């Protein structure tokens, strides 16, 4: 059922988008599994979800149509953030 195991996790990491053209979607959820399942199903997202960040403190999902290897994107450290990149788009 849960698809979070389809992702490579980078603890205490988030992605900052520098490119203005790139878009992101956010929503609060109860668990990181919900972020992962919504990302893989991509049903309610205007793009192909390739990764997401879970804000542990706010219980917020940040869905991205990009990952850490995409142009116009930078990694940043943060205790309350965990980055999950779907292995299907890594490398």
- Domains of the chain, by residue range, sit at 1-91
Q: Answer yes or no: are the C-beta atoms of 66 and 15 closer than 8 Å.
A: yes
As a whole number of angstroms, the longest Cα–Cα distance in the chain is 35
Return the C-alpha torsion angle 58, 63, 68, 69, nearest 10.
180
| Tokens encoding 59 | 């219980």
List the CATH code of the domain at 1-91.
Answer: 3.50.4.10
Element (H, E) at 11: strand 7-17
End-to-end CA distance of the chain: 26
Q: Answer yes or no: are the C-beta atoms of 53 and 82 closer than 8 Å.
A: yes
Per DSSP, 60 falls in state E
- Neighbour-count burial for 29-46, b at 16+ CB within 10 Å, e otherwise: eeebebbbbbbbeeeeee
């Amino acid at each position: 059922r849960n698809t979070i195991h389809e992702f490579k996790k980078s603890a205490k990491t988030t992605l900052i988008k520098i490119d203005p053209a790139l878009k992101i979607k956010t929503k609060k959820v109860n668990t990181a599994d919900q972020c992962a399942n919504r990302c893989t199903r991509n049903k309610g997202l205007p793009f192909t979800c390739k990764a997401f960040v879970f804000d542990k403190a706010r219980k917020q999902c940040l869905w991205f149509p990009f990952n850490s290897m995409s142009s116009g994107v930078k990694k940043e450290f943060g205790h309350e953030f965990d980055l999950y990149e779907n292995k299907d788009y890594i490398r």
